[PDB]
């Protein structure tokens, strides 16, 4: 599991929320992460107290090496994940994600951010070291099948906002996940350097065609 989250907070928030619906202090500095790895703290978007918040949350979830993904096919009915599907929905924004067929970087053709569905342990603001978030995954569709069998569940801006709502049930979230998934025809992709494999590599070049 690996993705890029390189731009500024405002770059990611433009499609999701007007200024007054956010409690996300202004910071003009790019997040600047070209190679986001599991087991690190990642800026995670969620809704509480009627506002969007951005909290640094552990990418991983360990029961009693940590899990990093939750399959959409089973998460909502999972004995482990069903409560998180109900109460711990979030969004992890990104520029695109990496997968290894030879690594590829996958991103929206229109250049807009991807809003990846996530589930995790609320309250997110507690900075838990073990009970963090997971990225929800789906089966690869269309051209993506030739790269890998899985992909992140990516939601449209409308669906991402709905997904995060505390007034939305697990059942409603399952409907939103189905109808709001961004299909593969909306993405482009290209091979990138093999350097992305080593997490010590963090340069801007990692997302460029090779």
Q: For residue 172, what are the contacts with CB-CB under 8 A and spacing of at least 6?
A: none
Name the token pair of 174.
């399952």
- Is 50 catalytic? The answer is no
DSSP per residue, 154-175: EE-HHHHHHHH-TT--HHHHHH
Q: Note whether 69 and 40 are within 8 A (CB).
A: no
Q: Note whether 78 and 70 are within 8 A (CB).
A: yes
Please give the angle made by the CA atoms of 90, 148 and 119, to the nearest 5 degrees: 15
CB atoms within 10 A of CB 134: 28
Choice among 99, 125, 175, 205 that is catalytic: 99
Please give the angle made by the CA atoms of 208, 8 and 102, to the nearest 5 degrees: 25
Q: For residue 140, what are the contacts with CB-CB under 8 A and spacing of at least 6?
A: 147, 148, 149, 150, 151, 184
Burial classification of residue 168, based on how many CB atoms lie within 10 Å of its CB (0-12 exposed, 13-18 middle, 19 or more buried): middle
List the domain boundaries for the chain: 1-210
Q: How far is CA 160 from the centre of its chain?
A: 10
Q: Say if domain 1-210 classifies as CATH 3.90.1680.10.
A: yes
Q: What sign does the CA torsion over 113, 138, 160, 133 have?
A: negative
Name the token pair of 53.
């918040």
> What's the half-sphere exposure (Cβ side, CA atoms, 13 Å) at 9?
20
């Amino acid at each position: 599991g690996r993705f890029a989250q390189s731009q500024t907070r405002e770059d990611y928030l433009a499609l999701l929320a007007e200024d007054i619906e956010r409690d996300i202090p202004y910071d003009p500095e790019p997040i600047g992460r070209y190679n986001v790895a599991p087991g690190t703290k990642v800026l995670l978007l969620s809704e509480r107290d009627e506002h969007l918040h951005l909290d640094p949350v552990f990418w991983g979830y360990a029961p009693g090496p940590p899990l990093i993904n939750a399959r959409v096919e089973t998460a909502a009915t999972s004995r482990m994940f069903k409560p998180l599907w109900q109460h711990g929905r979030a969004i992890c924004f990104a520029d695109g994600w990496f997968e290894w067929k030879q690594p590829f970087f996958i991103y929206r053709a229109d250049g807009q951010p991807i809003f990846m569905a996530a589930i995790g342990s609320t309250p997110f603001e507690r900075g838990d070291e073990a009970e963090g978030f997971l990225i929800v995954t789906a089966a690869a569709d269309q051209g993506l099948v030739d790269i890998h069998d899985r992909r992140p569940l990516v939601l449209s801006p409308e669906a991402a906002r709905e997904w995060m709502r505390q007034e939305i049930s697990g059942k409603e979230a399952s409907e939103i996940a189905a109808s709001g998934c961004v299909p593969a025809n909306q993405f482009s992709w290209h091979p990138v350097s093999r350097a992305v494999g080593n997490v010590k590599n963090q340069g801007a070049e990692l997302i460029q065609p090779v």
